[PDB]
Structure 1
Amino acid sequence: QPVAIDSNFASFTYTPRSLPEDDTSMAILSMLQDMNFINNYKIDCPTLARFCLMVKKGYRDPPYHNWMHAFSVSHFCYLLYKNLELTNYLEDIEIFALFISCMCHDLDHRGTNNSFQVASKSVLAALYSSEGSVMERHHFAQAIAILNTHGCNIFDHFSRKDYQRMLDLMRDIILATDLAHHLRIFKDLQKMAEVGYDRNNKQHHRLLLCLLMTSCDLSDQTKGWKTTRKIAELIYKEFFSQGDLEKAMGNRPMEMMDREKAYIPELQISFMEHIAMPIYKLLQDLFPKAAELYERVASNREHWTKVSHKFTIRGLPNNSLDFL
């Protein structure tokens, strides 16, 4: 199969979660073919196949941080290649690392965040806490463990030099999915939207790849409302289990993690306005064809305000007040 999968597939309006979970591995392959990476770097196919599937299995099934997330982040990366040029901004090998990274970026996520790993004193906190980005270093570790499983090393044929460059890229890109990181380099991304991008400046390449990894990581918000609301549910279900476990542990979770304080409308708005929209504003400034994505997140930002009134109980819940 080539992108025979759906007519909208290369479109920003297409929703990869619509794709049956059983057909996602194959869709990965179809995107690597259409961007022409498999013939570029002459990837061994049965090897790549095994890799794809070790990646898929490397994900667990919490509400949001699961394989269909990873698939869907990957899909958006593909859409950036189709709809933005990117090749005039980044070396092909960087775009291919961006896509493989997308696939691998939340591997073996346990449905909880970095501070919780530290709070609960998990094995992952012991390993990585002192360097930061606990989960993201673990995600990167898992990719590496897969690449060094027999028959899964999709780069075993790369030049020593090219293989090294794939490891650095994947590492840096996976690391950049920590939203803490993004928020730290936001002023650096801003300098690269005032002074303009410099195709020869290596730090601009590095910074651009981070912007687009995030852009992919948050790409559920660029779809229609139906999707945005469903994904909100999945996210808070996941966050509220974390809050619950933290109370049990005798700690106060963040407002957004605590199901007795979380006001979903405010939290979504704030996320849309101050995290997600400025990300796609920077994407638009760097790429004019990225404008619709900004407009799509702003639509969704305005639509939560259109529906927040609904979170105040007017009338009776159910027809009962026994909940007081």
Structure 2
Amino acid sequence: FGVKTEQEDVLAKELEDVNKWGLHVFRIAELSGNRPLTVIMHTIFQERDLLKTFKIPVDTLITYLMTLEDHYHADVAYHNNIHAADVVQSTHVLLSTPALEAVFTDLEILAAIFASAIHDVDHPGVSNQFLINTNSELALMYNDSSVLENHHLAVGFKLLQEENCDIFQNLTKKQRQSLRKMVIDIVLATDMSKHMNLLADLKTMVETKKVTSSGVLLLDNYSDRIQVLQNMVHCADLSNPTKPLQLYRQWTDRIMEEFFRQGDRERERGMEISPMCDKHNASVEKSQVGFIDYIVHPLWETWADLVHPDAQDILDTLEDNREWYQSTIP
């Protein structure tokens, strides 16, 4: 009657780590009754004063968040609400990096966080190539182009039309158009087929880096501003190997479960089994070292250069984890 239950109090204590890399997100999922995305989003919105800035009624925010979280599939091992919550929270920490202090507007911040929250929504647990090759409805709907990522956007935005779900109801049309475009640009950039171009552009930006007289980055056009936000959410999406090993390993188990399940479906149907998806011919450990060497380390090393030296502990953790996995390959 006015005061928190005890479970709620334990949850609130865990949520004091919301500004830290290494938040116990799985623990938060258990303590919130499988509402990690709702509670983490709500905490971040309060912390960054987004409800007041964007005149978001609190009941509307909570209704939307619960609705959004309910459209992540609980029967999907990796691409579920816990992953969404993790990417949100990691984006939130990245946005607070000292090298970006006062760089981004409140609308850009809103965009990056909202994008993170909706980015994998209604994910079926299989890849774009799988959807294309099976002639699935999603693939037909999006003419085989960034199928899943188009769908995540569409669902994220459509859910705003459910009863008391329109969290953007008080924004002007100009704010809504700008928000929408940024969100679209960010989520589409989460398709791994875009990774090499995103990284090439991030490298170019590091090579031509300009800093303000405060020492933070100078980003004076939309293209550079959106590029940084796109890479930031992409870093968050690829942040698992940079976390404390206990967290990383859980993510690895989850992604492997998801991939192996896809592989079983491919094998059942006589399709070629996708990379890392064959449980009879897999090395989990070699796959992780490969993932780090070819994808995650080149990205995070370049991000670390951009924000030097803010990401040094993250990069050190990544390199330790890489060595750990390497040492378990027989």
TM-score by length of 1: 0.90
**1:248 CA displacement:** 1.9
Correspondence 1:13 to 2:22: yes
Q: Higher mean Cα deviation, 76-85 or 218-227?
A: 76-85
Q: In structure 1, how many angstroms separate the alpha carbons of the residues matched to 2:262 and 2:274?
A: 10
Q: Which amino acid aligns with 2:62?
A: A
Superposition map of 1:200-215 within 5 A? 200-215=220-235
Quickly say closer, same or farther: Cα 1:7–1:54, change in 2 above 3 A: closer
Question: Is the 8 Å Cα contact of residues 73 and 123 (structure 2) preserved in structure 1?
Answer: yes
Q: In structure 1, how many angstroms separate the alpha carbons of the residues matched to 2:306 and 2:151?
A: 31
**1:140 CA displacement:** 0.4
* Secondary structure in structure 2 of the residue aligned to 1:167: helix
Superposition map of 1:69-148 within 5 A? 69-84=83-98, 86-130=100-144, 132-148=145-161
Task: Report what 1:158 is aligned to.
Answer: 171
Question: Is the 8 Å Cα contact of residues 3 and 34 (structure 1) preserved in structure 2?
Answer: no
Question: Is the 8 Å Cα contact of residues 124 and 138 (structure 1) preserved in structure 2?
Answer: yes
Question: Is the 8 Å Cα contact of residues 292 and 322 (structure 2) preserved in structure 1?
Answer: yes
Quickly say closer, same or farther: Cα 1:27–1:255, change in 2 above 3 A: closer
Correspondence 1:170 to 2:190: no
Task: Report what 1:295 is aligned to.
Answer: 316
Give CA-to-partner distance per residue, 1:162-186, whole Å, 9 cap, x none.
0011111111111111111122322
One of 232, 236, 239 as aligned partner of 1:216: 236
* Secondary structure in structure 1 of the residue aligned to 2:324: helix
Give the number of aligned pairs.
308
The CA RMSD over aligned residues, in Å, is: 1.8
Give CA-to-partner distance per residue, 1:48-77, whole Å, 9 cap, x none.
111111111010021111101111111111
Correspondence 1:182 to 2:191: no
Q: Which amino acid aligns with 1:123?
A: E
Question: Is the 8 Å Cα contact of residues 14 and 24 (structure 2) preserved in structure 1?
Answer: no
Quickly say closer, same or farther: Cα 1:6–1:147, change in 2 above 3 A: closer
Task: Report what 1:304 is aligned to.
Answer: 325
Q: Which amino acid aligns with 1:207?
A: Q
Q: Which amino acid aligns with 2:70?
A: K
Task: Report what 1:313 is aligned to.
Answer: none
Q: Higher mean Cα deviation, 299-308 or 85-94?
A: 85-94
Superposition map of 1:28-39 within 5 A? 28-39=41-52
Correspondence 1:242 to 2:255: no
Correspondence 1:68 to 2:82: yes
Identity of aligned residues (%): 27
TM-score by length of 2: 0.88
Quickly say closer, same or farther: Cα 1:82–1:90, change in 2 above 3 A: closer
* Secondary structure in structure 2 of the residue aligned to 1:289: coil
Task: Report what 1:322 is aligned to.
Answer: none
**1:5 CA displacement:** 4.2
Uncovered stretches (5+) of structure 1, i.e. residues with no partner: 310-324
Uncovered stretches (5+) of structure 2, i.e. residues with no partner: 1-8, 211-217
Q: Higher mean Cα deviation, 9-18 or 166-175?
A: 9-18
**1:275 CA displacement:** 0.6
* Secondary structure in structure 1 of the residue aligned to 2:100: coil
Superposition map of 1:33-48 within 5 A? 33-48=46-61
